[PDB]
Amino acid sequence: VRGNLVRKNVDRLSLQEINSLIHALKRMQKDRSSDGFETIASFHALPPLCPNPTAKHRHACCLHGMATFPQWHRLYVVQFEHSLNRHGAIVGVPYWDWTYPMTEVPGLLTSEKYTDPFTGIETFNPFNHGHISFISPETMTTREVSEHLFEQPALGKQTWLFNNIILALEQTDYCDFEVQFEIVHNSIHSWLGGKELYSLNHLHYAAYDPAFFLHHSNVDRLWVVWQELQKFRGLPAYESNCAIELMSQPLKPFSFGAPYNLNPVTTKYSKPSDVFNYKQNFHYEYDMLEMNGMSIAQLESYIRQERQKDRVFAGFLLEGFGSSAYATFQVCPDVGDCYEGSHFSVLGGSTEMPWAFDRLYKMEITDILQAMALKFDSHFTIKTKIVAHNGTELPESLLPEATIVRIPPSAQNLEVAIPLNRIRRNINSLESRDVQNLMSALKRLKEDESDFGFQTIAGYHGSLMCPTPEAPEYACCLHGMPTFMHWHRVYLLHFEESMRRHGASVAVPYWDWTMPSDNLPSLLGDADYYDAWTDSVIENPFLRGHIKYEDTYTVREIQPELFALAEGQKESTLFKDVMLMFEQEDYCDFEVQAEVIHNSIHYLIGGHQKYAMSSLMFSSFDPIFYVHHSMVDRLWAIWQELQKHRKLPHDKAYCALDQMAFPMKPFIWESNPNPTTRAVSTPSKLFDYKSLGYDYDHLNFHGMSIGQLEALIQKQKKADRVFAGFLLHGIKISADVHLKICIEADCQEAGVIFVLGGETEMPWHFDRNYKMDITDVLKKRNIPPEALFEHDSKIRLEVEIKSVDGAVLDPNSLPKPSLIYAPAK
Amino acid sequence: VRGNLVRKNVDRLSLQEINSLIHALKRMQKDRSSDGFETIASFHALPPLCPNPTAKHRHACCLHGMATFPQWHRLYVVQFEHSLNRHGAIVGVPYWDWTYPMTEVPGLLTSEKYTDPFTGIETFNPFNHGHISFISPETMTTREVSEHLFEQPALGKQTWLFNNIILALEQTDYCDFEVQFEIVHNSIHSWLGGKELYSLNHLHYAAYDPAFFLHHSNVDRLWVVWQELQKFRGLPAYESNCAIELMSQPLKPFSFGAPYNLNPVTTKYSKPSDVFNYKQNFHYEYDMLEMNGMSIAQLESYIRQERQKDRVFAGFLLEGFGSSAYATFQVCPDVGDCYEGSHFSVLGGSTEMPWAFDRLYKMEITDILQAMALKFDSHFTIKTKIVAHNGTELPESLLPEATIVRIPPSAQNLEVAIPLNRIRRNINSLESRDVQNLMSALKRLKEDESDFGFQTIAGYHGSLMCPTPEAPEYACCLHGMPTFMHWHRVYLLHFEESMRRHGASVAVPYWDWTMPSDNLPSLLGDADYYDAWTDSVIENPFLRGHIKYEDTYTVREIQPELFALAEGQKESTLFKDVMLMFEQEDYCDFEVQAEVIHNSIHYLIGGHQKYAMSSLMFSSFDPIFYVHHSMVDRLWAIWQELQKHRKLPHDKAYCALDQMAFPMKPFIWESNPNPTTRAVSTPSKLFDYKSLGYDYDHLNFHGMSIGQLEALIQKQKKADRVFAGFLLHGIKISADVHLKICIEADCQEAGVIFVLGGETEMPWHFDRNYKMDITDVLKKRNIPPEALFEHDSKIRLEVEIKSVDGAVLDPNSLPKPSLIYAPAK
Numbered sequence A, B: 001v002r003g004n005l006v007r008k009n010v011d012r013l014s015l016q017e018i019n020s021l022i023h024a025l026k027r028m029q030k031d032r033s034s035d036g037f038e039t040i041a042s043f044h045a046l047p048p049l050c051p052n053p054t055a056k057h058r059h060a061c062c063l064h065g066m067a068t069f070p071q072w073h074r075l076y077v078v079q080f081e082h083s084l085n086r087h088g089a090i091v092g093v094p095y096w097d098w099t100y101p102m103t104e105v106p107g108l109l110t111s112e113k114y115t116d117p118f119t120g121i122e123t124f125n126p127f128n129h130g131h132i133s134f135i136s137p138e139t140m141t142t143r144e145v146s147e148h149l150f151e152q153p154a155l156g157k158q159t160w161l162f163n164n165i166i167l168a169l170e171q172t173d174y175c176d177f178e179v180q181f182e183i184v185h186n187s188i189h190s191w192l193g194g195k196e197l198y199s200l201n202h203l204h205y206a207a208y209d210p211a212f213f214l215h216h217s218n219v220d221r222l223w224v225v226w227q228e229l230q231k232f233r234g235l236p237a238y239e240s241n242c243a244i245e246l247m248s249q250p251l252k253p254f255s256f257g258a259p260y261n262l263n264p265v266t267t268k269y270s271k272p273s274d275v276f277n278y279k280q281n282f283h284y285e286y287d288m289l290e291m292n293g294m295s296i297a298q299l300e301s302y303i304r305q306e307r308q309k310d311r312v313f314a315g316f317l318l319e320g321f322g323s324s325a326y327a328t329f330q331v332c333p334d335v336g337d338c339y340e341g342s343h344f345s346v347l348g349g350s351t352e353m354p355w356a357f358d359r360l361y362k363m364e365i366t367d368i369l370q371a372m373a374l375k376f377d378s379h380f381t382i383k384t385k386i387v388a389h390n391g392t393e394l395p396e397s398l399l400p401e402a403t404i405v406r407i408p409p410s411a412q413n414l415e416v417a418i419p420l421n422r423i424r425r426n427i428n429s430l431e432s433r434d435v436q437n438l439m440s441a442l443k444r445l446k447e448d449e450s451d452f453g454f455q456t457i458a459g460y461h462g463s464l465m466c467p468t469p470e471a472p473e474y475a476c477c478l479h480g481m482p483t484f485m486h487w488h489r490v491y492l493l494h495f496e497e498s499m500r501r502h503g504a505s506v507a508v509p510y511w512d513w514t515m516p517s518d519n520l521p522s523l524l525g526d527a528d529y530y531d532a533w534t535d536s537v538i539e540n541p542f543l544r545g546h547i548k549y550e551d552t553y554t555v556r557e558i559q560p561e562l563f564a565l566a567e568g569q570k571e572s573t574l575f576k577d578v579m580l581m582f583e584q585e586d587y588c589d590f591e592v593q594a595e596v597i598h599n600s601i602h603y604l605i606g607g608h609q610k611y612a613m614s615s616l617m618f619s620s621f622d623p624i625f626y627v628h629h630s631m632v633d634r635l636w637a638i639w640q641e642l643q644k645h646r647k648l649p650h651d652k653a654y655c656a657l658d659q660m661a662f663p664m665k666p667f668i669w670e671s672n673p674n675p676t677t678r679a680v681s682t683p684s685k686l687f688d689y690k691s692l693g694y695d696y697d698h699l700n701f702h703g704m705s706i707g708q709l710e711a712l713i714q715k716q717k718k719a720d721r722v723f724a725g726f727l728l729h730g731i732k733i734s735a736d737v738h739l740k741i742c743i744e745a746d747c748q749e750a751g752v753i754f755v756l757g758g759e760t761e762m763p764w765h766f767d768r769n770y771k772m773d774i775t776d777v778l779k780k781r782n783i784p785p786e787a788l789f790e791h792d793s794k795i796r797l798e799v800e801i802k803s804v805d806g807a808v809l810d811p812n813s814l815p816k817p818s819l820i821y822a823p824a825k
């Protein structure tokens, strides 16, 4: 016949709601009955009554430092709640959540006086302080506020309450949770109470402060949130697998029927095992179960994200000592300088029941060690100083010295709910609004003459500038080496960033040329369009790049073979070539294949022309260059996941360890528009693309899930194959290498290799030889591979080297290819 | 399948949420595309594209002053919403709700600059203002804040928004809702915008200010509330039964599926009929659906409560307009003195499509009309002076002079959700805690030496202090007359009011003596109890009230027949006495029956003693007095309920109007502790007990519902009955009048009557004769009712009047009874 009481946010309360709350607490404070505040406050600690109120010695009263701590305080809150429902509150016990960052202590808690808006009569605010009746009629609770409460997020840093609550919500075991949970809860006792004798910081006098119940309203809310989490994870939220022995022992003093606890329902559900079902048993709800505005789903995702990182903790073993105290620990390396670690607090009183935690209470020091430039396994110690409520050093003998525990990263897939503008999608799938946004954006970026502008970022690739501005005689980008992929990843990110700066809600799209295409995609090919908002006709920003120091626009002379490269269907050399690339389980072995095939598209779309995609020095000026590299980057993305699928390394590579360590030249300089690319300049850092903040929808090749990709790759390794190996290097210009096999003197159609380069080039030499399989070619000509080993049967390889210059053709410089027979294993 | 966007409260936003929002809007503002801010803001008004973007003359653009106003703007918001979701906002469009009273303008709107907490980078706040690009490039929106924004509830009065928001939600037809709903929405346009030309108050430029959208996120929410309300009532929420003509016509410019709207879902759902299902079609939710913290259930309860009241409205027929305007009306009586009436605003521009409401926009004037002490149908006029946006006074001819409408009170039962401590309960149903609460409070109250204290409030009835001290020579309480019930209603209230003042969470219990009782209920009967909290034994506060000026404690000498009077239990004289009381459909007829039965109990528990319940002058000092009057008051409450059921007057009476008008003497005096009893000292005010704020656990007699009571009452009238009529009046002392019918000098057991009085009394004469039916006594006596008409047959009536003091006894100073034959009909 009656609906649940709702515990609203304190600052959510209306004038009508506040009014009833204040008047209700006012009456239940003047109420000398057991239903009154002095009496309810007495349940917690100081006038002790819990062994039994008649006992000679009383170690009473409340449960602290044990798994049953949350239940006692839940039921204790419903005790206080039922009282002011009956004393006329229209709402349940409000909470202020420390889940959000703090600016001020709540008004209804701090304001000395209260004016009833409806009667206009100013009165003392019942929530400002509590009276401790038995000591003196004139003994008020008092408070002292720590700056710790009002902490705000820094650049990388997050507030103490945010971090430790999440570390608590992180737990999947109740007892593990409860330990972290309780000590987080100790904070506001510690931060509002302070050094003051009759306060939240003293176990005895705490419940006499009205704040206690607004506080623990939120403590209980956190537990429900954690309960909600356990339901979400398919775990037992309403039961406890650990500490089962304590779930039977009924909650005192509530367990006392007859004269001491008059509330019927509270007595009935005195077993902590019955306190689990709060909504059915005690009939109260929360308006919102949110941790800092996060949904239970948003919460769990965050948690799982945090679990993926490599984390190291400090562990403390906590035993009660009969007083409240504040703990400070520092991280100290072998070198003298010590840095400030963190803090935690204990709640305590002289009549506290002795307690000992059966677990380690963990605190996270990972961000601190990372700033200390020292890893988890390297020589650092923790010193801890703990002051009493009194307050003087405890000293140091009290708590066993802290332990340190690192948790290894756990490799598992995540949601990860990337923003809508940071996802790179197939250029064919783009909607019209995606098109207009991009085209409007790129024009502004090109017209941008600042350092963020298109001219400058185009210059990072092909201008004559690296290694340093004054010295070269050199070209800046990275080819052809293991860190080639890495360089163009930042470069692409740098482009994405500059785009958003001019209103791009669309990440740079990728054109998939591995699929059959009769023509260039419209976004890249189309010359002009009619804007409707002006009567003006605008030229497509994606089809023409201006090179300001050469006074020329880029040119695209598209070789007929590009469209003809991939018409299998699915039987395309380009498909087969890429599949051979995916096969590689080594990053370096994968990289050469990746870059050579990447050279192909450069050559064929801009060929036989200077100031084109074919020309390494100027290719970055053509806006397709970026659309192109969004594709090769995605091809890498597929491979990283392919590797992750095979358990082989994805985030790291055992290659170019001298390279991977060092940051990349054009980006790290002080002369860089955005701080973000400067930050991630190092190859090791940008190995994984998710941490960089973008993603591809989606990662799959020709309608094959990654399970299917590896499946056919295993199928290709099962057949005997023959390769031609090419050791490639810088020839200071672009070229096409044609390969053709001769059975005797007759030679037809073996294959083609493209090499990128420029007049201004960075001299490069490949660590190994690029492969291209002639397996299917030999089957076509009935030249059996085993006959390759035969001296009588004569086969030869001929290369036709023709530079971009046209033809020219070029004398034979590059090392001649090698035959590789790869038996199936 | 992407998760719904949530429209959060502004103040609820986390730092991360504010961050993603600010950067997103920052981007989409620099977005020159159609997806950008400048283009979307155009959709509303000034660069006018709406008839079609290419027309010579363009009536553009947004729908205003018509039924489909909410659908256009709902769709308009999802337009703006999807932009910044795609521009990277993690949350939906925040709302700023005026449902709560205002103190300030919300933060992300009012701060000129914003510093990213995470990067430490200070930037200009994108929500502070908007750019109007087609005017000068350095042209921004500005604001001007009216005092009206920050209105707070003072005494009985409530803020403009609260009053008028609810008036809108009150509506049951969509069109009637919409008309009120929209003028409400116009307030913040007028209040945030002000005199400024480029502001929210000018139709043209409003949407260029981002504040518009936070505003209209709440506007939509309010409609969703109203939708949710209509769902509660079993009415159509997702359809509109009125203005079906308009619901078909697609919303422009959204309707344009061309370069003008590149949003797919927006074009598809450009039908305003399609705009209703927001969650399915547009995929956005609200964090909470609450009007000033009130739930939808709480809302309708308030709304229904307001429908029971008698209300009068001023009506305005709104056609417009050249511009935005501010309207002001005053209420003026026959005499010249004017009071401030409310105000309202309209939104407009030079390019607005002509509009006319087909109904009256209602404003409420009931509260203020009362302050002018004049009724609705009487001699008063409304003059309105309306000033424009420029603003020259607009000619009275511009808007038709206002009309005035009175909406009659709708009599139907309500919820009404009364506080727990203000419920008066059957004394036997009380739990152990209510008992302890009652006692502790009464102890404090009797101890209380203040004017709020028991000595002073009990002195109100039994003194000797009626107007004017020290003239009396008089005695104050009101017996015996129609206003007897009224006087003792306030008295009981005054008693409750003072009890709460000492921590009583329990309203005064009623003890039902119509039910058979072996002894007095322990709350009244038990002498002492042992408090467990203090080792002391305390005596029950409910017996032996102390009388200060007589230095004597009251005594209860209980006559043996009181418990024996009700041995029926339905056959009990008391049930039959009360059932006869309920039968009266006139108030005064009801009053005499009630007050005589009232005297019966007063007399029998404290009989034959001075300083007792039987003594009129000192009955008030015995605590059980108040428990008794809780019972008779409940009897009156049931009677009132019956009158309502019988469709006869309940809240009013056609009896003595001389007495009903004047305030009552002990309470109205400036020498009264609490202002609440002073105000309601008038008998007219006290008629409905709910308006006073308390209630009874249930209104039912002997297991009969109020329907069953009237059913049995009709049953009794269906038989022939014989009464004896006693005209009673003030003799200066209490006495008991025994009725005895004698056939022929043989007399036995006819009935009994009691009358209350004291040395210090208020002289009283009853308006009628008390009736008591002897019909059952006669049928036992085998005396035919028709033999009463026989002169030949011998029967007569004798009264042996004995004083309260045994015997003493008194001579016959009261008129002898009259025989009344009531033929059944």
Ligand SMILES: *[C@@H]1O[C@H](CO)[C@@H](O[C@@H]2O[C@H](CO)[C@@H](O)[C@H](O)[C@H]2NC(C)=O)[C@H](O)[C@H]1NC(C)=O
Binding pocket: A321, A322, A323, A388, A390, A394, A398
């Ligand atoms: C201040 O507080 C500390 C913490 O309680 C006191 O330390 C305890 O004092 C009791 C005697 O009252 C001893 O029996 C305990 O062994 C002490 N425990 C510890 C850990 O010190 C301390 O005595 C107090 N001193 C002052 C100056 O107030």
Ligand SMILES: *[C@@H]1O[C@H](CO)[C@@H](O[C@@H]2O[C@H](CO)[C@@H](O)[C@H](O)[C@H]2NC(C)=O)[C@H](O)[C@H]1NC(C)=O
Binding pocket: B054, B055, B056
């Ligand atoms: C485009 O259409 C006409 C011009 O072709 C513009 O309106 C007028 O056209 C008539 C002839 O049909 C002329 O006599 C008027 O002098 C024109 N008026 C103006 C103001 O140009 C029309 O304005 C044009 N559409 C717009 C508004 O851009």
Ligand SMILES: *[C@@H]1O[C@H](CO)[C@@H](O[C@@H]2O[C@H](CO)[C@@H](O)[C@H](O)[C@H]2NC(C)=O)[C@H](O)[C@H]1NC(C)=O
Binding pocket: B321, B322, B323, B388, B389, B390, B391, B392, B394, B398
């Ligand atoms: C301010 O606005 C009002 C109307 O918004 C102006 O009055 C309008 O004047 C035009 C003539 O140019 C009339 O056609 C309109 O009917 C008028 N509006 C109404 C309803 O009165 C007024 O002139 C403006 N004030 C100034 C001087 O700027």
Ligand code: CUO
Binding pocket: A044, A062, A063, A064, A073, A185, A189, A206, A216, A347
């Ligand atoms: O309540 Cu027992 O301490 Cu937080």
Ligand code: CUO
Binding pocket: A461, A477, A478, A479, A488, A598, A602, A629
């Ligand atoms: O590699 Cu330098 O960019 Cu295609």
Ligand code: CUO
Binding pocket: B044, B062, B064, B073, B185, B189, B216, B347
């Ligand atoms: O809606 Cu167009 O005006 Cu606020």
Ligand code: CUO
Binding pocket: B461, B477, B478, B479, B488, B598, B602, B619, B629
């Ligand atoms: O009537 Cu004034 O006392 Cu019961």
